[PDB]
Design an enzyme around this catalytic site. Structure first.
Site, PDB file in Angstrom:
ATOM      1  N   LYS A  18      37.666  33.593  44.450  1.00  0.00           N
ATOM      2  CA  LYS A  18      37.246  32.278  44.220  1.00  0.00           C
ATOM      3  C   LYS A  18      38.083  31.372  45.418  1.00  0.00           C
ATOM      4  O   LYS A  18      39.143  30.955  45.245  1.00  0.00           O
ATOM      5  CB  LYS A  18      37.596  31.617  42.796  1.00  0.00           C
ATOM      6  CG  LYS A  18      36.891  32.060  41.831  1.00  0.00           C
ATOM      7  CD  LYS A  18      37.140  31.345  40.803  1.00  0.00           C
ATOM      8  CE  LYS A  18      37.431  32.136  39.278  1.00  0.00           C
ATOM      9  NZ  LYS A  18      37.916  31.226  38.125  1.00  0.00           N
ATOM     10  N   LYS A  37      47.792  33.018  45.485  1.00  0.00           N
ATOM     11  CA  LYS A  37      46.395  32.577  45.409  1.00  0.00           C
ATOM     12  C   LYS A  37      46.230  31.311  46.571  1.00  0.00           C
ATOM     13  O   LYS A  37      46.722  30.076  45.959  1.00  0.00           O
ATOM     14  CB  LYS A  37      45.693  32.708  44.390  1.00  0.00           C
ATOM     15  CG  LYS A  37      44.195  32.008  44.476  1.00  0.00           C
ATOM     16  CD  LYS A  37      43.406  33.238  44.924  1.00  0.00           C
ATOM     17  CE  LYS A  37      41.861  32.829  45.030  1.00  0.00           C
ATOM     18  NZ  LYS A  37      41.192  32.790  43.460  1.00  0.00           N
ATOM     19  N   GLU A  86      51.122  36.071  38.755  1.00  0.00           N
ATOM     20  CA  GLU A  86      51.668  37.520  38.286  1.00  0.00           C
ATOM     21  C   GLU A  86      51.166  38.303  39.230  1.00  0.00           C
ATOM     22  O   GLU A  86      49.973  38.370  39.423  1.00  0.00           O
ATOM     23  CB  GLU A  86      51.515  37.676  36.901  1.00  0.00           C
ATOM     24  CG  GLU A  86      51.715  39.135  36.135  1.00  0.00           C
ATOM     25  CD  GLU A  86      51.380  39.299  34.728  1.00  0.00           C
ATOM     26  OE1 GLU A  86      51.070  38.490  34.102  1.00  0.00           O
ATOM     27  OE2 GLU A  86      51.478  40.651  34.253  1.00  0.00           O
ATOM     28  N   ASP A 131      33.767  34.428  30.934  1.00  0.00           N
ATOM     29  CA  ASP A 131      33.834  34.940  32.412  1.00  0.00           C
ATOM     30  C   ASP A 131      34.523  36.439  32.296  1.00  0.00           C
ATOM     31  O   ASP A 131      34.906  36.890  33.414  1.00  0.00           O
ATOM     32  CB  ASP A 131      34.630  33.988  33.294  1.00  0.00           C
ATOM     33  CG  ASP A 131      34.082  34.239  34.774  1.00  0.00           C
ATOM     34  OD1 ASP A 131      32.907  34.662  35.095  1.00  0.00           O
ATOM     35  OD2 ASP A 131      35.115  34.014  35.479  1.00  0.00           O
ATOM     36  N   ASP A 149      42.131  35.077  34.867  1.00  0.00           N
ATOM     37  CA  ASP A 149      41.547  33.618  34.497  1.00  0.00           C
ATOM     38  C   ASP A 149      41.643  33.394  32.999  1.00  0.00           C
ATOM     39  O   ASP A 149      42.151  34.367  32.299  1.00  0.00           O
ATOM     40  CB  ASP A 149      39.869  33.249  34.775  1.00  0.00           C
ATOM     41  CG  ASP A 149      39.646  33.198  36.322  1.00  0.00           C
ATOM     42  OD1 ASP A 149      39.960  32.225  37.144  1.00  0.00           O
ATOM     43  OD2 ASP A 149      39.198  34.249  36.877  1.00  0.00           O
TER      44      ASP A 149
END
Ligand SMILES: COc1ccc(NC(=O)Nc2ccc3c(c2)C(=O)N([C@@H](C)CO)C[C@H](C)[C@H](CN(C)Cc2ccc4c(c2)OCO4)O3)cc1
Length: 250
Positions: A18, A37, A86, A131, A149
């Site tokens: 994403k 990320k 993590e 999701d 998420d």
């Protein structure tokens, strides 16, 4: 907890995600191994998802669980937002599934157990994930599931969300049915070649089982994939399913 990029040695590319890419990293001073990320502000602003980000962070402050990937913090520069994550050393469930092409009943029932614990926790803190899908699942060092998420591509969506009707936490129970099928069979139960056909297949709950799916497995899946959200089991009813109790190690 004022972090900056100079605090990290970045390592191997873990993959595209994403709104950017994930990398392995080590914190200079502690030598702690993490994932970093990178989110580009350009994509987030041009998608208009600042809200989902703010939500994620806020939920991550208050909520922690062994089967949910931890966010340790975040930081900014001009260009990018950096998420400090993590590290999940056995990678994605999607990679595993492509490899083995499908999973045995033991591996599925275990995964399903871990996931039901994650959601059961989530739902009590008033959080519906919406999701869960194999692309959004990682594996920790003991082979345990990690949801990437806190959440909020028709394949995993229930009829109520497809059509835009009111929906509650029974959503996630549908998704678990889909997941359970895909784990065993190697593809989701409503798969089709167009968006339009997949929509029709979900609306009408058209799934069939291959012959090697067992009576216990069909029972649990048949019960999760009910059009009517209120006919779908409670998470405890999943955890207490005879096919689950038989096959799960956890
Ligand atoms: C817009 O607002 C938000 C809301 C939430 C987030 N959070 C977020 O992006 N988290 C996140 C964490 C790990 C991820 C992903 C996403 C991601 O981008 N995924 C894709 C495939 C579709 O959602 C989920 C995967 C689990 C993805 C795995 N990949 C890309 C490599 C990877 C491999 C091993 C990893 C790892 C990441 O993190 C720890 O260990 O790893 C970001 C912005």
């Amino acid at each position: 907890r004022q972090w900056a990029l100079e605090d990290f040695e970045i390592g191997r590319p873990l993959g595209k995600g994403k709104f950017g890419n994930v990398y392995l990293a080590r914190e200079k001073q502690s030598k702690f191994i993490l994932a970093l990320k990178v989110l580009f502000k350009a994509q987030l602003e041009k998608a208009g998802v600042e809200h989902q980000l703010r939500r994620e962070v806020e939920i991550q402050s208050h909520l922690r669980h062994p089967n949910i990937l931890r966010l340790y913090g975040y930081f900014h520069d001009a260009t990018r937002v950096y998420l400090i994550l993590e590290y999940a050393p056995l990678g994605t469930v999607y990679r595993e599934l492509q490899k083995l092409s499908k999973f045995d009943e033991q591996r599925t029932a275990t995964y399903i157990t871990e996931l039901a614990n994650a959601l059961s926790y989530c739902h009590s803190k008033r959080v519906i994930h919406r999701d869960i899908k194999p692309e959004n699942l990682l594996l920790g060092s003991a082979g345990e599931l990690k949801i990437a998420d806190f959440g909020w591509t028709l394949d995993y969506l229930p009829p109520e969300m497809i059509e835009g009707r009111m929906h509650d936490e029974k959503v996630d129970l549908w998704s678990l049915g889909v997941l359970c099928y895909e784990f065993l069979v190697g593809k989701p139960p409503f798969e089709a070649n167009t968006y339009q056909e997949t929509y029709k297949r979900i609306s009408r709950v058209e799934f069939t089982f291959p012959d090697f799916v067992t009576e216990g497995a069909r029972d649990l899946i048949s019960r999760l994939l009910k059009h009517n959200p209120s006919q779908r089991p409670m998470l405890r009813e999943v955890l207490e399913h005879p096919w689950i109790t038989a096959n799960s190690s956890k």
